[PDB]
């Protein structure tokens, strides 16, 4: 729901854009395509819906 600073042991990888991949962002998993965004997130916001 919000920014987190305590995380489990897991290795990160490089960002892959414009391709259908399995992603995991701070514990949230799914499938989709990543593209640059023009939205403006405030400092206390982590996800958009």
């Amino acid at each position: 729901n919000a920014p987190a600073t305590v995380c489990g042991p897991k290795l990160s990888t490089d960002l892959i854009k414009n391709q259908c991949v399995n992603f995991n962002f701070n514990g949230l998993t799914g499938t989709g395509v990543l593209t640059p965004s023009s939205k403006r997130f405030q400092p206390f916001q982590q996800f958009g819906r």
């Binding site: 395509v33 593209t35 965004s37 023009s38």
Partner: protein, 49 residues
């Protein structure tokens, strides 16, 4: 007379084709059609033009 009638009725989708790239290139706008397509809802063209 047929010209006036067609202009008097507002239609949502002019055509029946919506390319994958176009929806991604228009993410900022909350297009209603792209939302339907990404959720498995489709509209089919009439046989008679």
């Amino acid at each position: 007379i047929e010209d006036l009638l067609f202009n008097k009725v507002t239609l949502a989708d002019a055509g029946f084709m919506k390319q994958y790239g176009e929806c991604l290139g228009d993410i900022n706008a909350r297009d209603l059609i792209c939302a339907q397509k990404f959720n498995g809802l489709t509209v089919l063209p009439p046989l008679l033009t």
